[PDB]
Amino acid sequence: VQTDPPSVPICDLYPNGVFPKGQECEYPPTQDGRTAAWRTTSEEKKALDQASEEIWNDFREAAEAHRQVRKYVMSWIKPGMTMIEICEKLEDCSRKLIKENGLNAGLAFPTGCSLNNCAAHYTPNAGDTTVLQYDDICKIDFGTHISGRIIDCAFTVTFNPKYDTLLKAVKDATNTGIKCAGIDVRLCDVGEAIQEVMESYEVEIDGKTYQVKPIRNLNGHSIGQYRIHAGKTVPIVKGGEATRMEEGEVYAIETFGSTGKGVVHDDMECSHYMKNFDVGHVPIRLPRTKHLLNVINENFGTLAFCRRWLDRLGESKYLMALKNLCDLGIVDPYPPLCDIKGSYTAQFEHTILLRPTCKEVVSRG
Ligand SMILES: O=C(NCc1cc(F)cc(Cl)c1)[C@@]1(O)CCN(c2ccccc2)C1=O
Ligand SMILES: [Mn+2]
Ligand SMILES: [Mn+2]
């Protein structure tokens, strides 16, 4: 059984190696009204589903580690803690439960703990003295993986009840996106449905009223093996592309709500980086740059990483080698994404499997 604090790897809690399924859903009906129930008992669909059983099982193991980590985080995350303390305590638990083992199992991307106007991609670098405040709105977004089968799942933390309606708006919008998702569903329809739900909410924060706006330049996305953003985008506003979701794809369904402009821009010091998946082999002679690329290739491959993780591996004086990798287009920087100063942003996110037989919200217990 799991300890308190959690320290037993998920693999040791399920001795037979069969990990728990997430929530299973029938796909939404078509506009004409034809149900998709036929998938659950179809001979061809069960065969295609069974063929990918090892892949779904890997996602389920990573999802169980993610659920146990986030229940642990909710039990202790409190104002007054530094953002570094929060990230290191969360990551220490995640490394243990996922039974971190090089590229076979581990952390899929850095722990995002973006605050207030910053909506995403913020994790502290060394020396960051930022402390979580009682009035902050903190987005905890972290990932686990087994064999590069990634769980991307996020939630918002608050201490002041004044943001409760903002959180409910975004949670309802994300649950709408999850409900609307399915094989052959136009991605633009998912976005329109999400916006319609999110914008039906009005919030009052310190005597100022706001209509909740989805962050138009943030979105959900397809997930590939060791590829957090596989190429398809799930909009959270109307006006997107009518491109459809397909059988066997994995999506992160996420929404962001804001009291600001509903648009993010790169801001602050960069902490997140990730190798460009489309860049092949590049011989490097420059020694510090060569060394850092070897470190990245061995420890992260195409998964996102952060500067704190390079520090933890014992690397130092690597910032110019890292900028060289960015300038060569081998690595890409992912700086914090912020709405206007004084604005509040919230996020909820789950990972879904578009299985031939059903839609499984694998990160939801
Ligand atoms: O977990 C997440 N990010 C991790 C990540 C770290 C990294 F370094 C590189 C990548 Cl691509 C992803 C998010 O859910 C939060 C924001 N976000 C997103 C950003 C822009 C457009 C659409 C979505 C995601 O996917
Ligand atoms: Mn995420
Ligand atoms: Mn995501």
State which ligand 1 atom lies nearest to the alpha carbon of 152.
Answer: 1
Measured in angstroms, how far is the CA atom of residue 217 from the centroid of ligand 2?
15
Which domains are present in the chain? 54-261+342-364 (3.90.230.10), 262-341 (1.10.10.10)
Cα gap 58→47, rounded to integer Å: 18
Measured in angstroms, how far is the CA atom of residue 42 from the centroid of ligand 2?
33
CB 59 within 8 A of CB 351: yes
218 ligand 1 Cβ < 6 A? yes
The type of residue at 190 is V
Q: Which ligand is nearest to the CA of 252?
A: 3
Cα gap 361→75, rounded to integer Å: 24
Residue 333: Cβ within 10 Å count: 15
Residue nearest to atom 15 of ligand 1 (CA): 120
Task: Please state the three-class secondary structure of the chain as a single string.
Answer: CCCCCCCCCHHHHCCCCCCCCCEEECCCCCCCCCCCCHHHHCHHHHHHHHHCHHHHHHHHHHHHHHHHHHHHHHHHCCCCCEHHHHHHHHHHHHHHHHCCECCCEEEEEEEEEEECCEEECCCCCCCCCCECCCCCCEEEEEEEEECCEEEEEEEEECCCHHHHHHHHHHHHHHHHHHHHCCCCCEHHHHHHHHHHHHCCCEEEECCEEEECEECCCCCEEEEECCECCCCCEECCCCCCCCCECCCCCEEEEEEEEECCCCCCEECCCCCEEEECCCCCCCCCCCHHHHHHHHHHHHHCCCCCEEHHHHHHCCCCCCHHHHHHHHHCCCEEEECCEECCCCCCEEEEEEEEEECCCCEEECCCC
Residue nearest to atom 3 of ligand 1 (CA): 121
Breaks (C-N over 2.5 A) in the chain follow: none
Distance of CA 293 to the CA centre of its chain: 25
Name the binding residues for a divalent metal cation. 141, 152, 221, 254, 349
State which ligand 1 atom lies nearest to the alpha carbon of 334.
Answer: 8
Rg (CA), the chain: 20
Residues serving a catalytic function are 141, 152, 221, 229, 254, 349
Residue with structure tokens 């962050």? 215
Q: Name the method of structure determination.
A: X-ray
- Among 353, 356, 340, residue whose Cα is nearest residue 23: 353
- Among 39, 69, 48, 30, residue whose Cα is nearest residue 365: 69
Which of 66, 219, 226, 229 best tests ligand 1's pocket when mutated (most atoms within 8 Å of CB)? 229
The type of residue at 217 is N
**Cβ neighbours of residue 307 under 8 Å, at least 6 residues apart?**
125, 126, 271, 273, 322
210 ligand 1 Cβ < 6 A? no
CB 94 within 8 A of CB 142: yes
Strands of 118-120's sheet in order across: 118-120, 337-338, 265-266
